[PDB]
């Protein structure tokens, strides 16, 4: 149980960019800037 | 308002007018200098 807790806390983490939500940087930043930032989030959240 | 080039930045903190949507949106007015402008950002302590 505390194994998926632990996994579904994580999506909330920022892993050091801006938003841990994909619908912030999409809906504001430019898309070379926001295709940097989901690529930061990507690979965070393949971490956990 | 935003399909205009009489105006010098359209600068929003396009991307901008899909993530105009909020609560009461205001129209803050005032008079600046060019050195002003500079500083109507977030921040700029």
Same mark, same amino acid.
């Given at each position: 149980?505390?194994?998926?807790?632990?996994?579904?806390?994580?999506?909330?983490?920022?892993?050091?960019?801006?938003?841990?939500?994909?619908?912030?940087?999409?809906?504001?930043?430019?898309?070379?800037?926001?295709?940097?930032?989901?690529?930061?989030?990507?690979?965070?959240?393949?971490?956990? | 308002?935003? @399909?205009?080039?009489? /105006? =010098?930045?359209?600068?929003?903190?396009?991307?901008?007018? @899909?993530?105009?949507? /909020? =609560?009461?949106?205001?129209?803050?007015?005032?008079?600046?200098?060019?050195?002003?402008?500079?500083?109507?950002?977030?921040?700029?302590?």
């Amino acid at each position: 149980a505390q194994a998926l807790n632990t996994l579904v806390k994580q999506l909330s983490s920022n892993f050091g960019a801006i938003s841990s939500v994909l619908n912030d940087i999409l809906s504001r930043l430019d898309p070379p800037e926001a295709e940097v930032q989901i690529d930061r989030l990507i690979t965070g959240r393949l971490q956990s | 308002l935003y @399909n205009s080039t009489f /105006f =010098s930045t359209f600068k929003c903190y396009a991307t901008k007018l @899909n993530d105009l949507c /909020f =609560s009461n949106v205001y129209a803050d007015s005032f008079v600046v200098k060019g050195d002003d402008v500079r500083q109507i950002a977030p921040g700029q302590t």
